[PDB]
């Protein structure tokens, strides 16, 4: 029954940073137990056509003005002049299947009214009250209704579709998304990590190799009345430590409050997680941001921008319904009055050619599409067939021609490979990250997690902290937080 | 008299409209000028075109109540009273040309970041210029050379929101959120007229320059225009601009009101923590439109230098940045200028150009020298026309050409005069580094005493410096007085 000072479950960035902090503080005899055959967790870099590398999990350093993880990276690059990231924010190109490009349009002025909708939402909630949540969709309808006298038909038709790019930030359809949580305050530009794995490896490299135990799935954690904690890997292995920092995803941890021990990733807690933790799961959920990588032979399209969003189909009928609806109740009725296509929801494409010089498109998708697409990620023919219409429309707007299917080995773009994410089906992630359905209050979880199960059983991860909640750097900071409190306690 | 309203600006006119709406009678509005409207004035130019030489937009249309009242009237009678003219800004540099929506400069994106940096830094108080310098030094590792060069010139469009150069402007008050889009009033004089005739015309007394306001502990206020006539009223609502009112706390100038007793301390102290901006306007009227109507918003950037970059790249800390930086002649390229292309939004062949201090006072001074004015702005006008797929400007101001129908022909220039009008002495409330506009607001909101009140764009928090702000302040003081008397 090997004795350890600290047992960290999960080798994601939280777990990795927690072990880093522990070592950095002189603490010895710690362990990092990871279920998968790799470290990184939701930070994973995959290889595709010709050795091209892509981050299939997180790709950006957000809030570069305050992001501690980013500043740390930025310093290294200032000292050795090595390119670790690239600021790739750009003027968004918006594409409708019909009206073509609708961005920066002298008549539509979509970005302008979008800015107003944003201020409208802020005014709607920033106004401290028992305001009451609703879906993001309902919030946009309420905006259209209140400002219809000041909007053209075209604005009422396309604005709603254009503002849905926010779905790609939460990984949720606007009808499943909480209005109160939709608008986040970006604190500066984003920086595209040129290998998030290099961030993972650098932190992993900061502590004892022998501390890492890969392919070990923790099944249960027990608190001994005799002040200490017992942990069981699935392969018989048993440990007992003074402290444990649990970093498994909110979705995996959620399995704990359910009866059935035979679930890949689920941990049996003894005593079971306190009611404040269990109940918090009813107040926060999990989104499904997913990715699809489209690799072409050569860059043969306009690199006017690295940011392109394809709007879902809209209809003149909708405008009419908005002009004639006498109120929000009636609007929903009139709206209620087939089958999902690549045009049934907005899709977000990153033109990597401009940003990194690679002839590939990194596309983001949201729930429910992500689940369906990830489910057929092996049927490459079906994937191409599904994304062909939009891939073409984009090439059309970027001065190129229809895409050619070259997946089974001049001016025409030829698709070589297609890589799809698998976060919703992977038992050790079960989705992308924490997100809010309407009525959800993310603070309940953050409080319950950061206050721990008890003095010895702690938590870290993107879902356990306010600043950078959902983000890689937030997960990172939570790792540091828990390790610091513990190294201080061990210091005594 | 029941209540005496000093000033026929929108604050004063609303106060009268309200007092009357509340059955109050026997009231007077004493205006020093020979017209009502104050800093709201629509002038007439070439071919009868009309322009607001004073305020021209309804800001914060999401919450602006004056705007909402105007929108209802239009929903009911269908008359156009305004148009939403926000547009994608076109940014023009003398050497480089258009630098907006640039796939490599992406200036709007760093401008936005700069904006967030400003919010973070103030969550002390320098000049907007200094704030911009800190940001440049602190983020240079993530900025390209051209961004370091052009962004600071682009971000200065904010000088036209305040009517103050970036070295005179308080960084703390530079950025201010907008409650939604702006709407161009198609006749602010319509707003003025509607409110003006919503009370007994015989209440209005034009060309009355109130010279002194006296309060006797014997529950009464005595006001007398400088032409000798004296008035005694229960309540007094003073709406003269902050600039004019600031003459009281000093020793005969035109417009100055002699208060007896003097203005309490809290008020006199407030003039120390709040100042006045000088937003100005120049109207360029062309024969007809012969340029591209891509956008209605065009800003010309002051010139920039690569030596400024090297200084940013080389500066050790913030203190040495200054040194290297503190190392003449004024031209149209010495500051950013904001041009509203009226053709796209109103169908009129004219540009409404906005300017700031220190430049405003200088151009208004030579407002009658058409030749001088055309010569000063010619370069930026040609640069604009070029960028808008047109030709250099032809001076057709002297009525007589025949060789046109191809190039833009300037037919007239109209300049504002707010900095030289003794009754406005500037444009509106504005902050210098170190100011705190809240003191003047509270000082004004509470008043000198129960019978010597204040109204005006400078006496309110929401809509501060705006036409609706002034409007609301007029209703405020009005109501409080309506209640007290209807008692
Ligand atoms: C598609 C996608 C795109 C995203 N894009 C960005 C972005 O651009 N920028 C950004 O900042 N964030 C982004 N995020 C979020 C970011 O990836 C996460 O916030 C971060 O990776 C979370 O790290 P973590 O340590 O909190 O959790 P994890 O990375 O999930 O680490 C938890 C670890 O626990 C392990 N584990 C689970 N169960 C067990 C068990 N029973 N026993 C042992 N080990 C177990 C898991 O294998 C995993 O390795 C994105 C996420 C996704 C999925
Ligand atoms: C060039 C310019 C552009 C602007 N653009 C906008 C804009 O787009 N949108 C917006 O909302 N706001 C704008 N503003 C500001 C707006 O015009 C003011 O906020 C508003 O007009 C203030 O109204 P007021 O009643 O408070 O002051 P005023 O209009 O100055 O009324 C005060 C009155 O008192 C009179 N008076 C002065 N002294 C005496 C005296 N001793 N005796 C009797 N009468 C006296 C003055 O003649 C004047 O009529 C702009 C201002 C300027 C100058
Ligand atoms: C959709 C999101 C995916 C990666 N970041 C997820 C953050 C989730 C925080 N809750 N990224 C973006 O929206 C984006 C948009 C423009 C440039 C760079 C990134
Ligand atoms: C007319 C002036 C705004 C005046 N409104 C009152 C502002 C008070 C700030 N204290 N400027 C603008 O509307 C403007 C708008 C966009 C760019 C530059 C200027």
Short mmCIF file of C-alpha atoms in Angstrom, two decimals, chain A residues 64-66 70-71 74-75 77-78 85 87 89-92 101 103-107 109 111-113 115-116 119-120 122-123 143 146-147 149-151 155 185-190 303-305 354, chain B residues 61-63 67-68 70-72 74-75 82 84 86-89 98 100-104 106 108-110 113-114 116-117 120 135 138-139 141-143 147 177-182 293-295 344:
data_model
loop_
_atom_site.label_atom_id
_atom_site.label_comp_id
_atom_site.label_asym_id
_atom_site.label_seq_id
_atom_site.Cartn_x
_atom_site.Cartn_y
_atom_site.Cartn_z
CA UNK A 64 -4.09 37.47 -23.70
CA UNK A 65 -4.06 40.67 -21.62
CA UNK A 66 -4.52 38.83 -18.31
CA UNK A 70 -0.18 32.96 -21.96
CA UNK A 71 2.06 35.60 -20.39
CA UNK A 74 5.02 34.90 -24.05
CA UNK A 75 8.02 35.44 -21.77
CA UNK A 77 9.39 33.53 -26.54
CA UNK A 78 10.78 36.93 -25.63
CA UNK A 85 1.78 31.12 -30.93
CA UNK A 87 -2.34 36.32 -32.94
CA UNK A 89 -7.89 37.45 -34.77
CA UNK A 90 -9.16 38.78 -38.10
CA UNK A 91 -12.17 40.52 -39.63
CA UNK A 92 -14.84 37.82 -39.81
CA UNK A 101 -20.79 37.27 -48.31
CA UNK A 103 -19.86 40.73 -43.72
CA UNK A 104 -18.86 44.40 -43.56
CA UNK A 105 -21.83 45.26 -45.80
CA UNK A 106 -22.69 48.92 -46.49
CA UNK A 107 -26.42 48.20 -46.42
CA UNK A 109 -24.35 46.56 -41.49
CA UNK A 111 -21.76 43.70 -37.26
CA UNK A 112 -23.18 47.07 -36.24
CA UNK A 113 -26.58 45.82 -35.11
CA UNK A 115 -22.98 45.23 -31.38
CA UNK A 116 -26.35 46.76 -30.42
CA UNK A 119 -25.43 46.02 -25.56
CA UNK A 120 -29.15 45.15 -25.38
CA UNK A 122 -25.98 43.52 -21.29
CA UNK A 123 -28.62 46.13 -20.43
CA UNK A 143 -34.32 42.03 -29.33
CA UNK A 146 -38.19 45.53 -29.29
CA UNK A 147 -36.18 47.10 -32.13
CA UNK A 149 -38.98 49.70 -35.99
CA UNK A 150 -35.25 50.37 -36.36
CA UNK A 151 -34.25 47.36 -38.44
CA UNK A 155 -31.19 42.86 -40.81
CA UNK A 185 -16.02 39.58 -21.53
CA UNK A 186 -13.03 38.84 -23.76
CA UNK A 187 -9.98 40.40 -22.11
CA UNK A 188 -7.91 41.15 -25.18
CA UNK A 189 -7.07 39.31 -28.39
CA UNK A 190 -6.66 35.54 -28.76
CA UNK A 303 -6.44 34.41 -47.84
CA UNK A 304 -8.32 37.67 -47.22
CA UNK A 305 -9.13 36.40 -43.75
CA UNK A 354 -3.35 32.72 -43.82
CA UNK B 61 -31.08 55.07 -28.80
CA UNK B 62 -31.73 51.96 -26.72
CA UNK B 63 -32.51 54.06 -23.64
CA UNK B 67 -35.30 59.68 -28.97
CA UNK B 68 -38.04 57.23 -27.97
CA UNK B 70 -39.51 61.03 -31.30
CA UNK B 71 -39.72 57.44 -32.53
CA UNK B 72 -43.29 57.10 -31.27
CA UNK B 74 -42.91 58.79 -36.27
CA UNK B 75 -44.57 55.42 -35.73
CA UNK B 82 -34.23 60.75 -38.11
CA UNK B 84 -29.85 55.46 -38.39
CA UNK B 86 -23.91 54.30 -38.14
CA UNK B 87 -21.65 52.77 -40.76
CA UNK B 88 -18.33 50.98 -41.17
CA UNK B 89 -15.66 53.61 -40.67
CA UNK B 98 -7.17 53.61 -46.79
CA UNK B 100 -9.53 50.41 -42.56
CA UNK B 101 -10.69 46.79 -42.60
CA UNK B 102 -7.10 45.95 -43.53
CA UNK B 103 -6.21 42.26 -43.78
CA UNK B 104 -2.74 43.02 -42.40
CA UNK B 106 -6.37 44.92 -38.58
CA UNK B 108 -10.02 47.95 -35.43
CA UNK B 109 -9.08 44.74 -33.67
CA UNK B 110 -6.17 46.23 -31.74
CA UNK B 113 -8.04 45.48 -27.40
CA UNK B 114 -6.75 48.92 -26.52
CA UNK B 116 -10.22 46.61 -22.97
CA UNK B 117 -6.79 47.62 -21.73
CA UNK B 120 -8.71 47.12 -16.97
CA UNK B 135 -0.58 50.24 -24.06
CA UNK B 138 3.18 47.11 -22.72
CA UNK B 139 1.93 45.22 -25.81
CA UNK B 141 5.70 42.32 -28.36
CA UNK B 142 2.31 41.49 -29.86
CA UNK B 143 2.01 44.45 -32.22
CA UNK B 147 0.09 48.78 -35.86
CA UNK B 177 -20.10 52.78 -23.60
CA UNK B 178 -22.94 53.59 -25.95
CA UNK B 179 -26.44 52.31 -25.32
CA UNK B 180 -26.92 51.15 -28.92
CA UNK B 181 -26.79 52.86 -32.31
CA UNK B 182 -27.01 56.56 -33.07
CA UNK B 293 -21.07 56.38 -51.28
CA UNK B 294 -19.46 53.32 -49.72
CA UNK B 295 -19.80 54.73 -46.20
CA UNK B 344 -25.13 58.11 -48.43
#
